[PDB]
């Protein structure tokens, strides 16, 4: 089966050389999930200009290291002009919390994966008394797509790295949600120069 | 801006949707770089079918909760039967030790990155003597990049959900080198039922 890959790898080189002979200085950072469903490529890019990171369920915690360091390198070093937090529809982390089956992932030897989906969780709990007014579980899950993506976003604008690039004219960072049914982008919300603060 | 990337996604979104309509669960988890140049898809399989996990220098720290939350959803809830470590070469944050610029990182108001990447400088400094034979930065920046490959791959297979499914004979490993120049994926290292560690 690495055999498979390595000639499925092949064909696609072979054709790439071909198409974009370029290829062979990105302008955006793309936060995203780890979901198999889409990429940096939903924006309509061509390889070279979207440098990603991508993980499960599009979390950036404040504090945490890998978020100031990629937000860091993106800005400072790499010089992107955007920074795009994008999450999903139908996001199998938040789809855990909301069906309350995040409380059996320790049973099935996914402790890990429990402790790492306590901030989904968080915003599960904190959101009970908005997502009883909605009927569908469809509808429960979109919102809580939605909501999530608002709270990484709110994260990364209060970043300091973010705030002076910002600032200064030289960042601006999109919230988006990515439709899996359709493969459209939704905007949830926006920080630039001239948004009021 | 943010009008260009809705057009541009619209765009895309219907390009994919004439093409492949059926194409609105993955058989392998895809570890790589953040690097904007290469991602899954140059694996050259169907979309949906590789879960990805991206971040800066491919890091895979063993006690890192995103790792261990990683494989565990990976291996034991999507059931991927092959877990995929792809650095590449041309690896910013291994030529920014390289060439010993990781130290004016605190100066420019980057010391998350310059404490993400202390695991690719200690991975230098380690190498440091195996490195005196290779006359050029070319050479050298080659050798990390393998190096690396392997570095993380390392700590991949001590993981007690990615040893119990290899064991079980239910998932294979491999450790793989993307050429930026060329687009093609070298074989470094592999793990299987009936492969030594
Ligand atoms: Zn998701
Ligand atoms: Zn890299």
Redesign the interface.
Known sequence: ??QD?????????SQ??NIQPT??S?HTLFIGC????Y???????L??????????ANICHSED??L???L??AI??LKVN?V?ICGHTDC?GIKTCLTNQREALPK??????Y???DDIDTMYHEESQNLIHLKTQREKSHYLSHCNVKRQFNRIIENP?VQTAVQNGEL?V?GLLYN??????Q?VS?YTKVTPK
Chains 1, 2 share one sequence.
Not at 47 to 56: D, Y
């Open positions: 089966n690495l890959i390595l000639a499925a790898n092949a064909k696609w080189a790439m050389n290829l062979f990105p780890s979901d198999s469903r990429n940096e490529n939903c924006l309509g890019v390889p070279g200009e979207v440098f990603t990171w991508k993980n499960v290291l890998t100031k360091a990629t860091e390198f400072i070093c955007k795009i199998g099935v030897n996914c402790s890990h994966l402790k790492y989906l790295t601006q999109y899996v049914e359709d493969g459209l982008l905007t926006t």
